[PDB]
Design a protein around this nucleic acid. Structure first.
Length: 756
DNA sequence: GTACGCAGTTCGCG
DNA sequence: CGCGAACTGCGA
């Protein structure tokens, strides 16, 4: 099983290292034969003699083109002639590529920003994370001494906890009477013992929760301050801190540093992403938080260090448990994308699609388009029309079916062969024509993306079959993870077409896909109303709710089935409308806001405050209980009484302040805000106290009693002192609970004033 | 990764 | 000094 690749330099030459786990043994394979390269498109072949002479400078050393070769390739499916330019070292390419591109005989250059070790995995056809190999994992976490207004890692690490299958332990340099605590004499001795623990356990994976931006950078700054060779790598190297975007990332050679934080952010939508919140959300068990101030107090007074050590131990333990849950998933993603787990677990959706496409392009001798430069990026900022949203027939409805298309956009892409290499391609004998926008797509050969998308959907169907028949539960689970990742990838192509930084960006493809989608959904709506007497209540992009006014439940279900058989004989190719469910009652608030209940009593909602992080729990729980009284009990009067009891508890300050927390993430640098709201005002006061605030930080605040701007009265919740602070009961009644429920109950004649 | 949509905060204008 | 526009977050 391949775990990772990198390269080192030997006498000026790159040597690829393939880190492997085969039959339980860590192994490094070395490859000295791989040459870095990129491509140049020339105005005339004779010009290669001049291009060959171009030089540049690296670390004082002259950079030259090593060797050149004319190759034939395809660009968007058309033959093209380019020159492959070879170099001695991969660091030669960034040094020289601009001077070559700028040459007057060079039209353009291609595949010039592909990192050498990832180039290697593609060109050799190697796939990471294949095989039945069991990886050894170890989570760890640190606890530190913090003083307000200090510089990063000015204070010592107090505890290092670690956990694996055999349990969890805490190393610390004060005496703590717990059986899982190992006591050492100093911070230095604690770090050194932790190093020895890692070396002795020799894990394949190190699991952290936010180790990329806290724990490893803290350990490095302490190791520097203390003069410790932080030799975590299997080659004896120290952890490598890399800048990645607005943030950092930490790699450990010969291991995989698995930081759960970016994995969870792009996998689960949660109100906050504290370790405690993620743990409870995933396993349903509570984890108590101990705050820095309590840690510092406990360390400085020596009082109650057992609480701190238990917190530290639980940190490592739940980090291990979350690692066990999420690593096999990401490992299947790594295998599907064909790049290392380290890279893939940290990569955005668009980047994941692009690396998969780069590999498929290589396999098909297709030269890759470049990422856009600044000019082209500005060219690509125009938008296009999206999905169809019908204005709902607002109110309460009965006996509702929901019908939707199976993977509408992937089905359109495959059926109509929507791809940049088929778009308006001349000389074909069959075309499909996008409605409204008019773009033509040739059908004479599978387009690059349709062909890949069809293979993905097919393989996903084969995997589900093998799952049902396999007796190995491990294989079945890993197959499950793979088929789920394939589905996600399949559903990512449409958005990637519209992604202005995409190599294979194609606005014409994107808007053809949404144009066909609008046509298919509005055609279906028109047919079910005109030929089957349904009334469509609401529709958004790829499905609709409908009923037959005055018909009983079984008539609506039967007639819906008859309509499906009718309509699906009219839909071409992969398009398929399906019966998604039957709902006894549904309430439609506005576009994108509804709630329905099935015949078993389960309520599902779209777009309602109940799922939003920026609405307080008191409002969300009140909305949930109202929806229960209406859809499940038909008891409007009960729902009204519920809102009144809630507002009465807020008025008497009887609601627990925990239910009053609002969460809103910071989306940009604090400097770039044109307007300041509550969460921005709270972020700025925190940052004014030294607190790191980056895009993606979730501000969790509560609104206190007073007047003026809400922003002026908002404090972070973990500063809420129930004696020094009184929350704004009128705000939570008037701006949170009542708005969330008024838009529902007004359909029955009530206004806000009747709900207090 | 995309477009479409609601709606709460804040501010400024007339 | 009510009303709307800008800004903002997050919801197929």
């Amino acid at each position: 099983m391949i775990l990772d690749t990198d390269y080192i330099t030997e006498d000026g030459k790159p040597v690829i290292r393939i880190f492997k786990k085969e039959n339980g043994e860590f192994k490094i394979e070395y490859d000295r034969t791989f040459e870095p390269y990129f491509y140049a498109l020339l105005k005339d072949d004779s010009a290669i003699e001049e291009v060959k002479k171009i030089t540049a400078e690296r670390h004082g050393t002259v950079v030259t083109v090593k060797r050149v070769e004319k190759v034939q390739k395809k660009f968007l499916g058309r033959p093209v002639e380019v020159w492959k330019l070879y170099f001695t070292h991969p660091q030669d390419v960034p040094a020289i590529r601009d001077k070559i591109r700028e040459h007057p005989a060079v039209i353009d250059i291609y595949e010039y920003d592909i990192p050498f070790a990832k180039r290697y995995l593609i060109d050799k056809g190697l796939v990471p994370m294949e095989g039945d190999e069991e990886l050894k994992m170890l989570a760890f976490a640190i606890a530190t001494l913090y003083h307000e207004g200090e510089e990063f890692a000015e204070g010592p690490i107090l505890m290092i906890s670690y956990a694996d299958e055999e349990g969890a332990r805490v190393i610390t340099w004060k005496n703590v009477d717990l059986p899982y605590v190992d006591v050492v004499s100093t911070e230095r001795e604690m770090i050194k013992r932790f190093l020895r623990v890692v070396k002795e356990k020799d894990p394949d994976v190190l699991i952290t929760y936010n180790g990329d931006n806290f724990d490893f950078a803290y350990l490095k700054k302490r190791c520097e301050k203390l003069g410790i060779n932080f030799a975590l790598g299997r080659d004896g190297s120290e952890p490598k801190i890399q800048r990645m975007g607005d943030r950092f990332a930490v790699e450990v050679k010969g291991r995989i540093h698995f930081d759960l934080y970016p994995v969870i952010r792009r996998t689960i939508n949660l109100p906050t992403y504290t370790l405690e919140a993620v743990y409870e959300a995933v396993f349903g068990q509570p984890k108590e938080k101990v705050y820095a101030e309590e840690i510092t107090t406990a360390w400085e007074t020596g009082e109650n260090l057992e609480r701190v050590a238990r917190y530290s131990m639980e940190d490592a333990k739940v980090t291990y448990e979350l690692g066990k849950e999420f690593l096999p998933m990401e490992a299947q993603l790594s295998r599907l994308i064909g790049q290392s787990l380290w890279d893939v677990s940290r990569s955005s959706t668009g980047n994941l699609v692009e690396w998969f496409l780069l590999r498929k392009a290589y396999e098909r001798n297709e030269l890759a388009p470049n990422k856009p430069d600044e000019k082209e990026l500005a060219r690509r900022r125009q938008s296009y029309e999206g999905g169809y949203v019908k204005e709902p027939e607002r109110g309460l409805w009965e006996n509702i079916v929901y019908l939707d298309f199976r993977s509408l956009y992937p089905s359109i892409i495959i059926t109509h062969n929507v791809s940049p290499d088929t778009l308006n391609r001349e000389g074909c004998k069959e075309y499909d024509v996008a409605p409204q926008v008019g773009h033509r797509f040739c059908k004479d050969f599978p387009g690059f993306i349709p062909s890949l998308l069809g293979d993905l959907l097919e393989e996903r169907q084969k995997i589900k079959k093998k799952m049902k028949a396999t007796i190995d539960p491990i294989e079945r689970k890993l197959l499950d993870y793979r088929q789920r990742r394939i589905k996600i990838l399949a559903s990512s192509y449409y958005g990637y077409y519209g992604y202005a930084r995409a190599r294979w960006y194609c606005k014409e493809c994107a808007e053809s896909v949404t144009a066909w989608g609008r046509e298919y959904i509005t055609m279906t709506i028109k047919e079910i109303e005109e030929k089957y007497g349904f009334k469509v209540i609401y529709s958004d992009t790829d499905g609709f709710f409908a009923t037959i006014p005055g018909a009983d439940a079984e008539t609506v279900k039967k007639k819906a089935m008859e309509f499906l058989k009718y309509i699906n004989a009219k839909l071409p190719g992969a398009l398929e409308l399906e019966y998604e469910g039957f709902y006894k009652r549904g309430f439609f608030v506005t576009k994108k806001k509804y709630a329905v209940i099935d015949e078993e009593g389960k309520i599902t909602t779209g777009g309602l405050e109940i799922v939003r992080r920026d609405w307080s729990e008191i409002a969300k729980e009140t909305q949930a209980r109202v929806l229960e009284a209406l859809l499940k009990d038909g008891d409007v009067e009960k729902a009204v009484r519920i809102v009144k009891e809630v507002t009465e508890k807020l008025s008497k300050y009887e609601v627990p302040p925990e239910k009053l927390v609002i969460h809103e993430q910071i989306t940009r640098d604090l400097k770039d805000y044109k307007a300041t709201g509550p969460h921005v005002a709270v972020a700025k006061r925190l940052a004014a106290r030294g607190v790191k605030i980056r895009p993606g930080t979730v501000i969790s605040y509560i609104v206190l009693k007073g007047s003026g701007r809400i922003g002026d009265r908002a404090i972070p919740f973990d500063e809420f002192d129930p004696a020094k602070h009184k929350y704004d009961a009128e705000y939570y009644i008037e701006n949170q609970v009542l708005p969330a429920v008024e838009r529902i109950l007004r359909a029955f004649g009530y206004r806000k004033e009747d709900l207090r």
